[PDB]
Design an enzyme around this catalytic site. Structure first.
Site, PDB file in Angstrom:
ATOM      1  CG  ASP A 286      -7.705   4.488   1.531  1.00  0.00           C
ATOM      2  OD1 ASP A 286      -7.877   3.402   0.916  1.00  0.00           O
ATOM      3  OD2 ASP A 286      -7.223   4.900   1.598  1.00  0.00           O
TER       4      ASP A 286
ATOM      5  CG  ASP B 253      -2.462   1.217   1.189  1.00  0.00           C
ATOM      6  OD1 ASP B 253      -2.539   1.397   0.161  1.00  0.00           O
ATOM      7  OD2 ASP B 253      -3.415   0.543   2.413  1.00  0.00           O
TER       8      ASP B 253
END
Ligand SMILES: *[C@@H]1O[C@H](CO)[C@@H](O[C@@H]2O[C@H](CO)[C@@H](O[C@@H]3O[C@H](CO)[C@@H](O)[C@H](O[C@H]4O[C@H](CO)[C@@H](O)[C@H](O)[C@@H]4O)[C@@H]3O)[C@H](O)[C@H]2NC(C)=O)[C@H](O)[C@H]1NC(C)=O
Ligand code: 5GF
Ligand code: CA
Ligand code: CA
Lengths: 83, 855
Positions: B529, B453
């Site tokens: 997200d 990430d």
């Protein structure tokens, strides 16, 4: 001579009992295999409390019964852990 | 979003300079006396009429109907960046022959035809044709712009954004070029944007932006750059498909305009002009063409196609084991449990919190006893800490990205002060791969996989939450030159780490947030997200379809939404949508309530269990589609127009999609919906509702009633879908089980389908040809199994336990023939209402040739 499903849905010869194909809507023709989606396998657990597991857990490679009887042709060799 | 944190085109000086050039007569002209033609390329000098700057055009015909155009300065002050490691090979060329020539034009034939290229000298232009059909023009609107390197104009040199000053040592060096697509009105691709599948005209607003950025609480239906960038644009019409691949790793803006004709303009901060024109003619030809350049989807290990349970964060080992036990106590399958940043020692990656995860090998052994895996997060930012071995080694070996003054760049991220390894350096990648050995990554085991990430890279105190433009990388290249491939290198180095730790035997599983062209070769990606809202559930389809079109087939969105708390109905619909998308993971933000699926009321648990059972039963089908993606470069999840290219009503559909050529999915995506409008395309096509077996004739819009447990899925007539009907707790448990074949008959009484099988997790299919690729075919009352690839052999206990035929009449007898056995009679059941025939227990090995005859 034939077997009748415990739910009365079919009558099959004994050769279709534990033949690894589901023939009864209640799963009663396959108590010893993983063939029925709603069946149960009995863990005898000799010397301790018996348990029933889902049929999908017979020969799944995971030790479900403390006696290891659910894994008889999977490659996983289960040890007796009933104590 | 806080839009003020991200530059608009007017705030990016190079975009503003390039975009201010409006259509007109180009000042560029080709100097035909300088033309040189060889077997691999044509080269010619171009000159800007006012500045007298000389450029070199390298024009090449390529095998498989492609053309490459490269433009660079003839005598540069310093070399310009050329993107490395994205192309998998030096593309095979096709010879250009002069078939016509005058004082202002040269006509070139590619090989023995039918493709031709017309080079016009003044103004400089290229026209690409197939015989007399003009496919595309280059520089038709005279928007070519090549800012030459000046001796090392607001913002042309030093430029500030907020409080961040870009020293811009090389000044203005942007490049840009326009393309005209006559007959095209629909264009797609250039992910990642939270926007429509069919791209919008950008004339009255912002261009689409390609710059890998971490955008907190991103919003929908806008052209702001998200986490990944794939500079590939597809164009579709009733008559043809075309593709444009702009190989540039710098910040890129794309303008789209309409006239029928669509014009595309690409504007990049630095590097050269390097563009591939993929001439199709079919969309499948374009997929093959692009796959020849950047490779195909890595074949996922089978477990990674199962269901993944994640959140930020599971508390400790006991919580992980309770979650594992929860799936089994509630009869819900799950292959992997994920560990976010709180599992580490204070966000020092490759470590374990000593109170929460004191015995990681014991936790991994318990998961292995349940035939499950774990995924641990490993980000590319390293805590600045003298007691942290990873930091000390990278600091001591000079492997961090540097600022211009030569010091190691330090920014703010999860561990606080952190440095950024230079993943563009091949030695840094080798070091990173080696860190995944079981000896170096203490506490790791073969059932531990990885999540990368924040690899844009995300820098909390940086301009636009990323690294300074003037930071310095391997070879002296600036961050501006390489930005969009930084994440891809992190992904690549991690995947190589997982392959090497196993001695080259095990296939990797790595999820990455940032990506570029070529990222399909390293694992999965997801849309970052997102938010627990109905519009974010809807947008997961066009976002993953835009990725599928440009080669990134292993895509998904966080099930339930990352930010906020979904209502139970939304969580159910999200499980159903996710169950039919390639990467299937539930994930949630730190401040959200727990949402393991057994925490809901029974009605919701039951609908979620149903969706999980559908997914697990379809694993043989999913695995086969991924094998076809790996071998051919064809997308797994597809827009309807790829399957119905002449149906103009499908060109903008994004509330429906197909999986291969066999299943059409229309997930419910509105609260309180009691039905959905399903478009079933195809003249003379038939579709079967997979739950009811009701047959529907195309083309039509069907209003289908739905309940909470409904997942609107239709099987196309003419296909054979394989399933594992014995759903167990994980894919490893199921991977040796018998198959049920679902045969959906076409109106002509025919069907076909393939099935790929292997061990589920190694490279043995490629190094030892240990696999099976079967073809199932139905025609004129007979179903046949034959080999689709005779090189593949596999010892397997898998057998055919059942055949379900939709659209069949009642036979009098069913006969099975297989080599090495006498003829067999099968029992059967038939429903005359639905015309569904079930053949009981064929009993034959999946590795054998066989035939079943009805009557
Ligand atoms: C590289 O490019 C070449 C040239 O474009 C390409 O070859 C061409 O492929 C197309 C298929 O995409 C061929 O088109 C067919 O032509 C025949 C007649 O010659 C028709 O019978 C075909 O009709 C079918 O499809 C129609 C709809 O498109 C239907 O209406 C009809 O009912 C049929 O089902 C079809 O039009 C074309 O002939 C060739 N051209 C040449 C010169 O070979 C090649 O495939 C490309 N190669 C790669 C590797 O990309
Ligand atoms: O690591 C914490 C996190 F918030 O950051 C990063 C990803 O975008 C998230 O999915 C992840 O959970
Ligand atoms: Ca039976
Ligand atoms: Ca078991």
């Amino acid at each position: 001579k034939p077997f009748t499903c415990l739910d009365g849905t079919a009558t099959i010869p004994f050769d279709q009992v534990n033949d690894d194909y589901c023939d009864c809507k209640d799963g009663s023709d396959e108590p010893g295999t993983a063939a029925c989606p709603n069946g149960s396998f009995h863990c005898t657990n000799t010397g301790y409390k018996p348990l029933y597991i889902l049929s999908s857990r017979v020969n799944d490679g995971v030790c479900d019964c403390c006696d290891g009887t659910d894994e008889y042709n999977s490659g996983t060799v289960c040890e007796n852990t009933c104590r | 979003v806080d839009r003020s944190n991200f530059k608009t085109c007017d705030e990016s000086s190079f975009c503003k300079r390039q975009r201010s050039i409006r259509p007109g007569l180009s000042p560029y002209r080709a100097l035909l006396d300088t033309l040189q033609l060889g077997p691999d390329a044509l080269t010619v000098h171009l000159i800007h009429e006012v500045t007298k700057v000389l450029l070199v055009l390298e024009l090449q015909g390529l095998q498989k109907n492609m053309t490459r155009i490269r433009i660079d300065e003839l005598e540069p002050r310093r070399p310009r960046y050329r993107v490395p490691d994205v192309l998998v090979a030096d593309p095979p060329t096709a010879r250009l022959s002069v078939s016509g020539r005058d004082d202002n034009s040269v006509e070139l034939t590619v090989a023995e035809g039918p493709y031709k290229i017309i080079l016009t000298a003044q103004p400089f232009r290229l026209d690409l044709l197939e015989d007399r059909s003009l496919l595309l023009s280059v520089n038709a609107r005279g928007l070519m712009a090549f800012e030459h390197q000046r001796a090392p104009e607001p913002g042309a040199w030093e430029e500030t954004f907020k409080t961040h000053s870009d020293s811009k040592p090389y000044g203005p060096t942007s490049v840009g070029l326009d393309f005209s697509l006559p007959g095209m009105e629909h264009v797609y691709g250039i992910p990642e944007h939270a926007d429509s599948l069919r791209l919008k005209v950008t004339e009255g607003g912002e261009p689409y932006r390609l710059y890998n950025l971490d955008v907190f609480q991103y919003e929908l239906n806008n052209p702001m750059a998200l986490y990944g960038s794939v500079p590939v644009l597809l164009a579709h019409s009733f008559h043809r498909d075309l593709g444009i691949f702009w190989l540039n790793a710098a910040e890129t803006w794309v303008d789209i305009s309409s006239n029928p004709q669509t014009d595309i303009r690409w504007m990049s901060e630095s590097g050269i002009i390097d563009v591939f024109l993929m001439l199709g003619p079919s969309v499948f030809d374009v997929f093959r063409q692009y796959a020849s350049l950047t490779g195909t989807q890595a074949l996922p290990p089978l477990f990674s196609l199962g269901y993944h349970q994640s959140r930020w964060n599971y508390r400790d080992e006991a919580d992980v084991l309770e979650v594992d036990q929860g799936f089994d106590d509630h009869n819900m399958p799950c292959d992997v449990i994920w560990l976010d940043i709180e599992h580490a020692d204070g966000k020092r990656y490759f470590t374990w919190d000593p109170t929460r995860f004191p015995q990681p090998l014991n936790m991994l052994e318990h998961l292995a006893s349940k035939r499950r895996k774990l995924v641990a997060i490993v980000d590319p930012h390293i805590k600045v800490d003298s007691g942290y071995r990873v930091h000390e080694e990278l600091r001591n070996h000079g492997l961090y990205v540097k600022t211009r003054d030569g010091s190691d760049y330090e920014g703010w991220c999860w561990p606080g002060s952190a440095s950024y390894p230079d993943f563009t350096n091949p030695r840094m990648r080798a070091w990173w791969s080696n860190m995944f050995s079981f000896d170096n990554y203490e506490g790791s085991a073969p059932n531990l996989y990885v999540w990368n990430d924040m690899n844009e890279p995300s820098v909390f105190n940086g301009p636009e939450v990323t690294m300074l433009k003037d930071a310095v990388h391997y070879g002296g290249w600036e961050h501006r030159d390489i930005h969009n491939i930084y994440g891809l290198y992190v992904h690549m180095a991690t995947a190589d780490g997982l392959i090497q730790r196993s001695g080259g035997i095990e296939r990797p599983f790595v999820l990455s947030r940032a990506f570029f062209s070529g990222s399909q070769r390293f694992g999965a990606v997801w849309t970052g997200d997102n938010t627990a809202e109905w519009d974010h559930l809807k947008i997961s389809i066009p976002m993953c379809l835009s990725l599928a079109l440009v080669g990134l087939s292993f895509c998904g969105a966080d099930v339930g939404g990352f930010f906020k708390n979904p209502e139970p109905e939304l969580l159910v619909r999200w499980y159903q949508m996710g169950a039919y998308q390639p990467f299937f993971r539930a994930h949630a933000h730190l401040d959200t309530g727990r949402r393991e699926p057994w925490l809901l009321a029974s009605q919701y648990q039951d609908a979620i269990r149903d969706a999980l059972f559908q997914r697990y039963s379809l694993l043989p089908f999913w695995y086969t589609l991924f094998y076809q993606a790996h071998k051919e470069g064809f997308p797994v999840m597809r827009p309807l127009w790829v399957q119905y290219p002449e149906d103009m009503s499908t060109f903008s559909i994004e509330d429906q999609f197909m999986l291969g050529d066999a299943l059409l999915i229309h997930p419910v995506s509105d609260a309180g919906a009691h039905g959905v409008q399903v478009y079933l395309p195809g003249q003379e096509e038939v579709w079967y509702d997979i739950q009811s077996y009701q047959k529907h004739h195309g083309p039509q819009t069907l209003y289908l009633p739905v309940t909470l447990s409904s997942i609107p899925v239709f099987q196309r007539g003419g296909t054979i879908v394989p399933r594992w009907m014995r759903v167990r707790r994980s894919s490893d448990c199921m991977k040796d089980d018998p198959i049920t074949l679902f045969v959906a008959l076409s109106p002509q009484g025919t069907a076909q389908g393939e099935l790929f099988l292997d061990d589920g997790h190694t490279f043995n299919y490629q190094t030892r040809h240990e696999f099976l690729l079967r073809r199932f075919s139905f025609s004129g009352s007979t179903l046949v199994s034959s080999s689709a690839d005779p090189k593949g052999h596999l010892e397997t206990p898998i057998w055919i336990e059942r055949v379900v035929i939709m659209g069949a009449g009642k036979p009098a007898a069913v006969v099975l023939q297989t080599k090495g056995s006498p003829e067999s009679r099968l029992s059967f059941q038939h429903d005359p209402e639905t015309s569904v025939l079930i053949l009981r227990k064929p009993g034959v090995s999946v590795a054998s040739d066989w035939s079943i005859h009805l009557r």
